[PDB]
Design an enzyme around this catalytic site. Sequence first.
Site, PDB file in Angstrom:
ATOM      1  N   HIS A 216       0.808  -1.202   0.000  1.00 40.77           N
ATOM      2  CA  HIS A 216       0.000   0.000   0.000  1.00 40.77           C
ATOM      3  C   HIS A 216       0.841   1.252   0.000  1.00 40.77           C
ATOM      4  CE1 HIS A 216       0.274   1.308   4.334  1.00 40.77           C
ATOM      5  NE2 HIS A 216       0.196   0.032   4.652  1.00 40.77           N
ATOM      6  N   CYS A 217       0.263   2.303  -0.566  1.00 43.01           N
ATOM      7  CA  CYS A 217       0.718   3.675  -0.414  1.00 43.01           C
ATOM      8  C   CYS A 217      -0.323   4.378   0.458  1.00 43.01           C
ATOM      9  CB  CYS A 217       0.995   4.313  -1.792  1.00 43.01           C
ATOM     10  SG  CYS A 217      -0.220   3.975  -3.095  1.00 43.01           S
ATOM     11  N   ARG A 218      -0.891   5.494   0.010  1.00 45.12           N
ATOM     12  CA  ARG A 218      -2.003   6.097   0.746  1.00 45.12           C
ATOM     13  C   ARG A 218      -3.322   5.476   0.276  1.00 45.12           C
ATOM     14  NH1 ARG A 218      -2.304  12.012  -0.262  1.00 45.12           N
ATOM     15  NH2 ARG A 218      -3.946  11.797   1.320  1.00 45.12           N
TER      16      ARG A 218
END
Length: 282
Positions: A216-218
């Site tokens: 994940h990122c944001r």
Amino acid sequence: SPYGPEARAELSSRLTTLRNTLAPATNDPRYLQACGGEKLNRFRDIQCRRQTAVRADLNANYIQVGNTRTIACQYPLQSQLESHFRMLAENRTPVLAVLASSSEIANQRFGMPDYFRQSGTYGSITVESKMTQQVGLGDGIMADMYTLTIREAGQKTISVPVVHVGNYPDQTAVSSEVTKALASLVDQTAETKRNMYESKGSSAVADDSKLRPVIHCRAGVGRTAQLIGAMCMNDSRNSQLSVEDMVSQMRVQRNGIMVQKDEQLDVLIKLAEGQGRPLLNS
Ligand code: VO4
């Protein structure tokens, strides 16, 4: 011609049509809807395909690109942390790759809990974080590694390797060279950990839904999708899988935004060109 501007425009055209088809309607049967009144989606327009959802209270999806199996998710909300840790433990997660930067995490307006660099207790789950290696990825980009030990009564204790790209830029894309280095580190970390489970005779080895890298990122659609695409190009099983295939697969299995920015697609195109891998399906 296979990598010319015309081919690239055709790829973008096909992908844009798909994004439109996959846009969420109100109470869309294709997308996970919140139960019990808790906020589900970090971003209102970035939804979780229902049929590949990992947990009813997370924005997180099982994704298979060719043969490569992963989980892509949003950065968990504070209210989601216990469930997120249970996801990580139940999956026997061989690597968690976090592509939101330290600067992003530190911005408290974004509501991204620092859940992997600190220890804590979240409902019934106790987590300890320990710092491990640091691996340079090129262009000054650094992967800071950790191990998370996740404990809960009634559950086996699980330790999860973490790769955090602490200085991932938020305004620009990382190059194909950095992306390749990141994919290699994430894959290698996963292979070492999966091997440990194999050596112990874990039943997770036989289960399609487990032993998946979690990325994940944001939002889990931009940097995350760039990395997943690079990882699938590292997989010996994926000969002839096109860029069209990979992006279409990510989109159908998570949402239509996967590979959010043209700059990210440019990296995938460059990686494919380096392998002589097709952009388009004939
Ligand atoms: O509960 V196990 O995945 O260590 O067989």
